[PDB]
Design a protein around this ligand. Structure first.
Ligand SMILES: *[C@@H]1O[C@H](CO)[C@@H](O[C@@H]2O[C@H](CO)[C@@H](O)[C@H](O)[C@H]2NC(C)=O)[C@H](O)[C@H]1NC(C)=O
Ligand SMILES: [Ca+2]
Ligand SMILES: [Ca+2]
Ligand SMILES: [Cl-]
Length: 276
């Protein structure tokens, strides 16, 4: 396993956002042309094993461990956003559903219950950083223009599952049709054109930017988002998403959380300007 490998993301110009927003309240619009300098992006979400190497090196205690709780989706059980999100005492990256759960059987799955601060700590320890939202989105799009997904516009191209999201009736029944009810290994499913895995679906992914929904149509170069805010931007959707209630497994989709937030469907990957 080379689950910390990076890929070179080529320099280019791309259309960020969409003039056909699917969740208008999220500021998916307007479409805008963005220039991105060549950089490196992690091929994989950061895994449990990779995060454990960081904790072993540094002794880092995550925010969820210090607070003593984290959000867990009710459907995984053996001050919430929805009735299916429960603050669970003792839920954290080593104990993803609570104190009696474990990561021993899922070392290669994405690390969960990591806050934005935890993610920055990891990436910086690794000689990396979080990607900006624009870098993330450019990378997600995998060299295609104005597509819904990393691979195109069909959810199941050639009848194949291309990402780990929900099938069935959310939140009561996840059929596991795509092979995974919860997370999948970080190297599951096909890569996109740049070499990236699970950039939509599996775990949500933190980015560096402060959240706003007010964007200019002006062309920009390596944008970093607004200089201030209260929530940081997360991208890509998770194993929970479904067209019926949370259609956020699109590269243009976007959501947010306070930087000290953590949950059972939220992880990250790193980026870098040059190879560490
Ligand atoms: C994190 O550190 C732990 C603790 O030292 C490592 O787990 C140990 O690994 C060795 C070698 O396989 C075993 O002999 C020890 O008994 C393990 N400790 C116990 C009791 O769990 C672990 O491999 C490190 N994690 C990573 C991802 O490198
Ligand atoms: Ca699934
Ligand atoms: Ca993901
Ligand atoms: Cl789009």
């Amino acid at each position: 396993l080379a689950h910390s490998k990076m890929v070179p993301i080529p320099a280019g110009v791309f259309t960020m956002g969409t003039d056909d927003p699917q969740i208008k309240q999220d500021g998916e619009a307007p479409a805008r042309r963005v220039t991105i300098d060549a950089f490196y992006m992690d091929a994989y979400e950061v895994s449990n094993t990779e995060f454990e190497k960081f904790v072993n090196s540094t002794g880092y205690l995550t925010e969820a461990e210090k607070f003593g709780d984290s959000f867990v989706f009710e459907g995984m059980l053996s001050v919430a956003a929805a009735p299916w999100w429960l603050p669970v005492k003792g839920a954290n990256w080593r104990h993803p559903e609570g104190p009696d759960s474990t990561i021993l059987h899922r070392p290669d799955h994405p690390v969960l219950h990591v806050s934005w601060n935890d993610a920055v700590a990891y990436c910086t320890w690794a000689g990396k950083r979080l990607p900006t939202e624009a870098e993330w989105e450019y990378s997600c799009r995998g060299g295609l223009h104005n597509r819904l997904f990393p691979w195109g516009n069909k959810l199941q191209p050639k009848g194949q599952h291309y990402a780990n999201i929900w099938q069935g009736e959310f939140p009561v029944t996840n059929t596991g049709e795509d092979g995974f009810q919860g997370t999948a290994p970080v190297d599951a499913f096909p890569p996109n054109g740049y070499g990236l895995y699970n950039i939509v679906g599996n775990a949500w992914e933190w980015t560096s930017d402060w959240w706003t929904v007010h964007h200019s149509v002006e062309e920009t170069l390596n944008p970093k988002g607004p200089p201030s805010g209260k929530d940081r931007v997360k991208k890509g959707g998770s194993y929970m998403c479904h067209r019926s209630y949370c259609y956020r497994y699109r590269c243009a989709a976007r959501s947010q959380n306070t930087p000290d937030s953590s949950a059972s469907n939220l992880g990250f990957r790193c980026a870098a300007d040059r190879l560490p």
